[PDB]
Amino acid sequence: MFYHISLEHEILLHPRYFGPNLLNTVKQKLFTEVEGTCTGKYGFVIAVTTIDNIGAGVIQPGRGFVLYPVKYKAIVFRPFKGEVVDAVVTQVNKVGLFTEIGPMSCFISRHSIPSEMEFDPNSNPPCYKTMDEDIVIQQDDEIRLKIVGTRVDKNDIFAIGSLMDDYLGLV
């Protein structure tokens, strides 16, 4: 869920980049180093809303840089287990379904897809549809999916959706 929380992170400043304006350098550092990142505990670090507090700068004994504990409002998103979320279909496969939720790629495998919602490569777009041709989930569609589980790998999270429960599929 898209969340507005406060996160604490430490920024490290070399004396070479102290400059006349020091706090703006720290703001740029924070706006660069956490943005677009993903943590297994807090999910996708979407954006930093407002840098709230700048802590006292403890110079590391012996080594040169200073250390800034920083508290800041941040917009974040972390996938959950068991929630229906809107998504954009990126690819339809005989094995599964490639869907997208913001920056997260979600894989909906066909065994977790009901039997009526069959795959057809004969159509010009390889797509999922039923025998009645009423529900046609194809490329660039707006659908809803049931998130079963999420896996984090290489500092980002991808999830698996399903369509077993009611009111799941094309909007």
């Binding site: 706006f31 943005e35 677009g36 990142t37 996708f44 670090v45 979407i46 954006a47 913001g102 920056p103």
Partner: peptide, 10 residues
């Protein structure tokens, strides 16, 4: 510089 990929994606 420009913001992250997640930024404009979201």
């Amino acid at each position: 510089q420009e913001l992250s990929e997640v930024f404009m994606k979201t």
